[PDB]
Amino acid sequence: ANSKLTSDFDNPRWIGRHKHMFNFLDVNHNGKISLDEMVYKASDIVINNLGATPEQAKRHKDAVEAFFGGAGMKYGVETDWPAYIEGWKKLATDELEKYAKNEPTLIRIWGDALFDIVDKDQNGAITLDEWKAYTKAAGIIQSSEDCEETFRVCDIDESGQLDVDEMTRQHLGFWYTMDPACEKLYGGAVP
Ligand SMILES: O=C1N2C=C(c3ccc(O)cc3)N[C@@H](Cc3ccccc3)C2=N[C@@]1(Cc1ccc2ccccc2c1)OO
């Protein structure tokens, strides 16, 4: 019964969750962001902060390129807020369709590529310390307390780890469907 698989695009809390992220991504307050910037940020984090090998970094870049690409972003194009949020409606729709058909989603492909870098053991799950390292390098969470709230919201495994399958589920609820069970996934960092 639990999980919510229907989009909720007219919910002001959905629009506002993505506007928060648009603003967080628009670090110089240009009112527009490009695919060039998104793939730069992605590879800067993994290579310069998280120890990615060259092959790992390239995999991660392809996943991020495809993800924001699915939201309509392109190299050499500056995407403003109205174009961004309409593109996000298309991304969320396509992702929910793939998920319902048991086909790999762009968010899962990104998770797999990131977790290969972030999980010291390369077995598809991360410790709280590893989650702190990733999110604080990206900047999506600033405080340890918000990082800890992720581990409250998510189902944590028998070793105290957040597995990529569970986090993919949580991301569908949080980014795509406004599932009430996924609120506070990023603590107070992302409304
Ligand atoms: O899910 C993750 N996101 C989501 C976003 C996001 C941004 C805007 C928006 O409107 C919606 C979502 N941004 C980053 C941060 C980022 C942006 C651009 C380049 C590099 C980083 C991010 N990071 C993730 C990465 C992630 C982390 C764990 C995962 C686990 C399973 C599946 C997918 C996963 C994905 O965690 O917060």
Side-chain angles (χ1 to χ4, degrees), residues 18 21 25 38 41-42 68 84 88 107 110-111 114-115 131 134 140 164 167-168 171 175 186:
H18 292 289
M21 291 306 298
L25 291 171
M38 302 302 92
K41 180 185 179 76
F68 292 103
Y84 182 80
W88 254 95
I107 189 65
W110 184 5
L114 183 57
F115 275 32
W131 181 236
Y134 169 68
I140 193 171
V164 69
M167 193 49 155
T168 294
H171 277 163
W175 301 127
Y186 288 81

Side-chain angles (χ1 to χ4, degrees), residues 43-166:
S43 298
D44 194 321
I45 291 154
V46 303
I47 291 169
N48 292 326
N49 304 147
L50 306 175
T53 70
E55 293 94 332
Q56 287 174 334
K58 290 173 180 76
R59 183 193 175 174
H60 184 259
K61 182 222 97 201
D62 288 351
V64 168
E65 178 184 84
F67 181 82
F68 292 103
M73 297 186 63
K74 302 182 185 324
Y75 293 116
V77 174
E78 314 254 271
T79 302
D80 67 10
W81 164 249
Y84 182 80
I85 194 62
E86 231 267 60
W88 254 95
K89 295 176 190 186
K90 294 178 186 91
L91 175 60
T93 296
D94 293 346
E95 292 277 275
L96 286 167
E97 175 174 52
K98 290 173 179 176
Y99 193 77
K101 294 190 278 126
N102 268 216
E103 298 167 354
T105 52
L106 301 172
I107 189 65
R108 177 53 182 260
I109 293 161
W110 184 5
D112 281 345
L114 183 57
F115 275 32
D116 197 54
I117 293 157
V118 170
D119 178 1
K120 180 210 197 201
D121 300 326
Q122 299 174 278
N123 271 142
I126 60 170
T127 63
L128 180 57
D129 286 338
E130 289 163 341
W131 181 236
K132 290 181 177 167
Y134 169 68
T135 56
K136 296 182 176 192
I140 193 171
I141 308 179
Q142 296 292 304
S143 66
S144 283
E145 178 175 359
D146 286 335
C147 293
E148 292 158 10
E149 188 150 17
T150 303
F151 277 52
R152 170 228 121 206
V153 171
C154 295
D155 278 349
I156 296 308
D157 82 14
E158 300 96 328
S159 70
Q161 296 186 61
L162 175 55
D163 128 272
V164 69
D165 174 69
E166 168 69 356

Side-chain angles (χ1 to χ4, degrees), residues 3-73:
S3 65
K4 179 176 187 306
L5 306 178
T6 58
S7 59
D8 235 287
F9 296 151
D10 287 329
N11 286 346
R13 304 193 53 261
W14 186 76
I15 295 160
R17 176 161 298 162
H18 292 289
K19 218 172 179 194
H20 174 95
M21 291 306 298
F22 179 92
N23 287 332
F24 157 76
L25 291 171
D26 182 23
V27 293
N28 287 133
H29 321 275
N30 294 312
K32 330 160 166 151
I33 54 171
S34 60
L35 195 59
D36 308 76
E37 285 165 337
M38 302 302 92
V39 305
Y40 192 91
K41 180 185 179 76
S43 298
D44 194 321
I45 291 154
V46 303
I47 291 169
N48 292 326
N49 304 147
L50 306 175
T53 70
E55 293 94 332
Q56 287 174 334
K58 290 173 180 76
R59 183 193 175 174
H60 184 259
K61 182 222 97 201
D62 288 351
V64 168
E65 178 184 84
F67 181 82
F68 292 103
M73 297 186 63

